[PDB]
Design a protein around this ligand. Sequence first.
Ligand SMILES: Fc1cc(-c2cc[nH]/c(=N/c3ccc(-n4cnc(N5CCOCC5)n4)cc3)n2)cc(N2CCOCC2)c1
Length: 330
Amino acid sequence: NQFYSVEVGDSTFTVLKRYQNLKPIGSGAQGIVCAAYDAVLDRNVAIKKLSRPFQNQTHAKRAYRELVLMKCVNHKNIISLLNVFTPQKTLEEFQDVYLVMELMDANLCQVIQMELDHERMSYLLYQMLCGIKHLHSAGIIHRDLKPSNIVVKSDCTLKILDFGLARVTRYYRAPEVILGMGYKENVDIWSVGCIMGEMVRHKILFPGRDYIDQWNKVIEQLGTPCPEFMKKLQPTVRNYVENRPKYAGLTFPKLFPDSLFPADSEHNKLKASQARDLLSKMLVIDPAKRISVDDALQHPYINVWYDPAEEREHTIEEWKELIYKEVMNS
Ligand SMILES: Fc1cc(-c2cc[nH]/c(=N/c3ccc(-n4cnc(N5CCOCC5)n4)cc3)n2)cc(N2CCOCC2)c1
């Protein structure tokens, strides 16, 4: 009797009666996420349904990670779980997991549409780098950060929704992932560069129409990479890059003109310089040349926010056991 059902999108959410007035908030790769109101806590929450997460390896490792690491990757800038629950009575009938989170006012897509403000942008970027620093400290390298999986409250507080990849749309993925040529921690830095440049441009930086067109749209802008970057590409992929035309790219001033930034001040003039110098350090193809999370936090555009104070594979059935026992703990 504790549960009721409601249509959400193309699906059915079955949730505890404390959650009321379910309104679609958006959708993603675990489908619809609903806003609701929590009567027992008297606030708004966001509810996401994992439909058969144990169904295959990739769904299962993702749900399982999300469920365990939410208990130890505590963060100021990482969203938190208020509640996890299934409407099913036993392991045998177990099907779906519902993840309940604090409700945030918008995603970054919505904030990118706004006019360029230097205090807002450096604040947001600071929080993002910090959230990511903490992801790394806990052994999590995300690899999939995009405006749609970062959310912000109305006072510009920011939280990363999820933990990303395991281990068409590649607009924000790093050159080292596209090419499947191995990665280190500064892979997340590239996604922060794409996001910051989009705040300046109000247009997707690398808006590819295919896996191939994505790579050109990146080389057309930043220029072709060096010989040392190349020699590290797995032999099939090495030929497609090396054998293309050489592209020269554009200077960061011509990638992000003066006309995109506020002005008629020396503050604004300094800030524009700082923004572009950070852009030029994040938006670098070769991961060996790309600024790290720590140096990005010390960057003069960002450091004004500093505050003295601060793998195994399993059976379907074993995954179901694992996930189910995690749901029965809190
Ligand atoms: F206006 C808004 C307020 C809030 C909001 C506020 C609080 N918590 C919250 N919880 C959320 C929201 C969304 C997601 N995911 C969305 N996509 C995925 N994927 C797809 C690919 O990668 C794997 C999982 N998770 C997860 C938790 N969402 C959320 C948005 N959208 C709604 C969802 O989409 C973009 C943000 C808009």
